Design a protein around this ligand. Structure first.
Ligand SMILES: COC(=O)c1cc(C(=O)OC)cc(-c2cc3c(=O)[nH]ccc3o2)c1
Ligand SMILES: COC(=O)c1cc(C(=O)OC)cc(-c2cc3c(=O)[nH]ccc3o2)c1
Ligand SMILES: COC(=O)c1cc(C(=O)OC)cc(-c2cc3c(=O)[nH]ccc3o2)c1
Lengths: 117, 118, 121, 121
């Protein structure tokens, strides 16, 4: 149920393949200048008791056109059904000097759906 | 650089390779083979040249051939090179839960990695 | 209109707060989840002179999960901002830390996000 | 309780607190220099009847970054636990939320961690 195209609440798109070995691979777009590689992992044998499927992935914000010197990790769970969702919290760390490291990391949350909001 | 064997402050072992394409690959051990897990992630392969660190992140899903915790951790942070290289991170650990239990699904913390055991 | 009032989060918890002229938040919190029963004391702070450029009003508060009925040996802090409008809202992210031994400290802190409205969802 | 007194974090900040019998935390948060323009009110809560099994004491507090001299339109909450002894510590994680427009709310909140000791670093 994970493989395919997902859309967050703020206009980003997330195209992922969930491989048989637990791999997540794909592209994240916040135009080619805005598309970035993503990789991660998911539980390939989740429980069948109503619990979600744990997963996570990373995007480093560098491509052939731009580089923000930063990276976001999303940690969350996939929930299947008629209104399937991937519910996540995220951390976005920028490369900083030591003096600025205290303010290097933003935190937030993203909800992804199989239909554009 | 990033490629190498790292240890967090609690003794976990992080064996990583940073590839030319921005890929992180390797294994994470939270001393036995039953405790070794696949990791994948990404890093900035062209960092700034002003003294700033190198941003990165990776994920471990806590399933291997021997155990399955139905959970996954992501680490987000930066590599700081120099005399004692370090990777400073903050992490999120999400378990698969029912909807009624989702409010308590995610733990948060911080790990610092060096090339020497604690 | 303003922060003072009774708010409900997406799970039905009840947040009764007064925003004082000196920047103080005081009131009570009743949790719809966890090892909790009845009302708990909260205190916190808010920006009593927010920017005039359309930005929200920053704030934060703490509940220690001890009252006359129960003690969970834990505390939650909510950090967020109030956003005025036709449907006023307080958007927060929270940290819930339990008292633990050192060996268990790595798993002492849960994290999440709560959104509050003056209308109970 | 062991919490009342002056604490110092890893980056020079100084945390001056009174732990009341009812679970109240009150005091002042300032820089290493301690000039008036760096001092802010703090309020929070702690578990006034912690467990007796060697666990820490859960607590939290908030500072809104407004005083009589400046206003950054933001607030920080620290969530953590106090651990007593000859090397007493308060180990925390924190969230710093700035007031923003809706378009910028995704980048409103920083996260980090502070460790406080009874002696200057
Ligand atoms: C223009 O470069 C980008 O596309 C870009 C750049 C940065 C950055 O830190 O640069 C200052 C951050 C993001 C970003 C997206 C995103 C998301 O969708 N959910 C979670 C966080 C998040 O962060 C995207
Ligand atoms: C036997 O299962 C494990 O080895 C295992 C299981 C879980 C789990 O949450 O299972 C529900 C979590 C970890 C783990 C390690 C680790 C770390 O080193 N830094 C950051 C967090 C973290 O989480 C390891
Ligand atoms: C004179 O103003 C200050 O000294 C000052 C101002 C701000 C501010 O305006 O934030 C927008 C923030 C801090 C501060 C300290 C601190 C800390 O110790 N741990 C966690 C974060 C943190 O933030 C100090």
């Amino acid at each position: 149920g994970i493989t395919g195209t997902w859309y967050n609440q703020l206009g980003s798109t997330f195209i992922v393949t969930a491989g048989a070995d637990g791999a997540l691979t794909g592209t994240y777009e916040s135009n080619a200048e805005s598309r970035y590689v993503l990789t991660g992992r998911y539980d390939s044998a989740p429980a069948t008791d109503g619990s979600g499927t744990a997963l996570g992935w990373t995007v480093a914000w560098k491509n052939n056109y731009r580089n923000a010197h930063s990276a976001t990790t999303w940690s969350g769970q996939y929930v299947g059904g008629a209104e399937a969702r991937i519910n996540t919290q995220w951390l976005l760390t920028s490369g900083t000097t030591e003096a600025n490291a205290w303010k290097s990391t933003l935190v937030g949350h993203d909800t992804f759906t199989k239909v554009k909001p």
